[PDB]
Amino acid sequence: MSLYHKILIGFVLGVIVGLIFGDKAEFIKPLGDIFLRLLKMIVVPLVFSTIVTGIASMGDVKKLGRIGAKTLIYYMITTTLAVTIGLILANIFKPGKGLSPSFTETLLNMIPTNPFEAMAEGNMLQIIVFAIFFGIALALMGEKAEPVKKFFDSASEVMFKITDIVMKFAPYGVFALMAWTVGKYGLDVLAPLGKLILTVYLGCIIHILIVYTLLLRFLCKINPLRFFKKIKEAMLVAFSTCSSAATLPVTMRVAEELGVPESIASFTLPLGATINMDGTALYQGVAAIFVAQAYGVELTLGQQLTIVLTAVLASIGLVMLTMVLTSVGLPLEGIALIAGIDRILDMARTTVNVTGDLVATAIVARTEN
Numbered sequence: 001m002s003l004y005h006k007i008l009i010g011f012v013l014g015v016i017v018g019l020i021f022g023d024k025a026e027f028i029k030p031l032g033d034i035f036l037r038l039l040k041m042i043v044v045p046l047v048f049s050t051i052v053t054g055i056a057s058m059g060d061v062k063k064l065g066r067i068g069a070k071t072l073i074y075y076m077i078t079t080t081l082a083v084t085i086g087l088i089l090a091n092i093f094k095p096g097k098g099l100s101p102s103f104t105e106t107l108l109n110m111i112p113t114n115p116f117e118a119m120a121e122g123n124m125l126q127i128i129v130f131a132i133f134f135g136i137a138l139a140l141m142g143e144k145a146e147p148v149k150k151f152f153d154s155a156s157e158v159m160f161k162i163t164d165i166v167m168k169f170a171p172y173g174v175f176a177l178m179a180w181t182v183g184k185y186g187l188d189v190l191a192p193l194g195k196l197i198l199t200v201y202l203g204c205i206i207h208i209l210i211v212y213t214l215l216l217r218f219l220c221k222i223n224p225l226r227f228f229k230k231i232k233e234a235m236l237v238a239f240s241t242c243s244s245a246a247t248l249p250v251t252m253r254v255a256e257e258l259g260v261p262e263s264i265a266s267f268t269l270p271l272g273a274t275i276n277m278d279g280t281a282l283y284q285g286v287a288a289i290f291v292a293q294a295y296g297v298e299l300t301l302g303q304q305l306t307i308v309l310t311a312v313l314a315s316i317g318l319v320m321l322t323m324v325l326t327s328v329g330l331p332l333e334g335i336a337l338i339a340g341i342d343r344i345l346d347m348a349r350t351t352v353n354v355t356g357d358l359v360a361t362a363i364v365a366r367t368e369n
Contacts (some may be wrong), residue, residue: 003167004233010171011178011240018182025183028176035173038166039237039246042159044122046249047270048131049156054266055135056149064136064267067364071268074360075276076312081211082278082352083311086285087304089203095195095286096293099337106316124245124274135267156266163249174240185344193341196290203282204348212359220366230258231358238354242346244273251354258358260365268364272357279352281311283345284324291325291334303328317349318342 018025058064090096110125112118118126138145138152190197216224228235234254238247248270255265288307292299299307310327314320318339325332338345 003170004236006171007174007233007236010173010175011236014175014178015182017175018179021179022183022186025179029180030176032173032176032180035166035169035176036241036243036246038169038173039241039249040243042163042166042249043124043245044119044127045155046159046163046252047124048119048127048134049152049159050252050266051128051131051270052135052138053149053153053156054263055132056138056145056152057263058267059139059142061136061139063368064132064139066368067264067267070364070367071271071360074363075272078211078276078278078356078360079281079312079315080308082207082282083285083308085207085211086203086282086311087289087307089199089206090286090289090293091304093195093199093202094293095193095199096290096295099192099294103313124270128271128274132267159249160253163253167250167253170237174237177240181343181347185341189340190344193337196286196338197341197344199290200283200286200345201348203286204279204352207278207282207352208355212355216359216362220362222362222366227258227358227362230254231355234354234358235351238350239347242343242350244277244350244353244357247350247354248273251357255358255361258362260361261369264365265361268361269357272360273353275316276356276360277315277317277349277353278356279349280317280320281315282352283317283349284311284314284321287321287334287338288324288328288330290338291330292328294334294337295331297330299328317346 017028055064110129112123112126112130115126115130117123118130138149213224216222216227231251231254234247234251237250238244241247251273252265252269255269256262258265285307288311289299306328307324310324314323318335321338322332322335325334
């Protein structure tokens with residue numbers, strides 16, 4: 001037996017129970033909530049320890065700068081590609097037819113005024129910034145940082161052990177989540193928006209198979225089939241959990257199983273999970289086109305171009321869409337139509353997000369080795 005097969009069995013059984021039990025499957029919700037709580041309990045300390053120990057291991061600060069620049073460039077390019085794919089798909093298909101602070105301030109507040117305040121509030125960007133500073137400091141001092149460096153390395157190992165412990169509960173948590181979701185979102189809810197569901201799922205699948213797969217094949221020069229076969233656990237947990245932050249422990253678990261240098265995975269994975277929301281951008285574009293079609297607004301290519309920029313910026317899930325709608329002028333009431341099926345879309349959004357994070361890690365690791 002294996003952890004993945006147990007998780008897969010739990011997923012299938014949860015789907016079956018949710019179908020047969022239907023609405024009465026909410027009785028199982030607490031079990032899934034326990035799993036989500038356990039997953040989220042590990043993110044902060046794991047993120048900090050892993051980032052610090054990864055940057056410390058590098059020893060070359062100049063190297064970290066190249067990795068960061070390449071990772072950011074990749075995130076921007078792939079998010080733009082995701083929005084483009086979403087717009088093209090929502091234009092070729094027509095799901096909507098027939099239905100009816102300042103940026104400069106946001107760049108600030110990424111610098112914590114109090115590291116412990118950021119830790120307590122779970123401010124991921126601030127924690128990442130402080131962890132980068134801490135790791136750079138550790139890398140630049142060397143021998144003088146041995147106690148703190150060793151403590152944080154051991155802490156990272158301990159948090160990975162904890163992630164291993166909780167993942168043993170993963171089959172039952174995934175069973176509960178799938179049962180609850182399939183019970184709550186009955187076919188009646190999907191019937192009117194089946195076009196949108198198909199469009200979003202197909203957009204995500206096309207992104208995975210055309211952007212990620214071709215990149216892995218041609219730039220990384222590595223097979224995509226084994227890549228997915230290795231990261232299967234992370235994708236499945238992201239699909240079941242509907243949150244990149246809660247799935248981050250599993251992505252970081254599988255990243256080392258992938259064999260990329262642990263420093264590279266450690267530095268990038270949390271940052272991407274916080275920013276690299278490719279699936280979210282694709283869904284935002286799809287929803288913008290959907291509401292435009294629903295209300296009969298024939299957005300021009302000039303207007304469609306604005307969607308790309310606004311969706312790319314929005315990443316730095318349903319609430320964020322309002323900015324995309326406002327930017328080009330679609331009525332904000334269109335949120336109500338999609339609000340009833342948000343979780344089903346979130347599943348694919350988070351799956352694509354985690355897949356993109358792992359693909360980015362593979363690309364940046366391969367580029368320098």
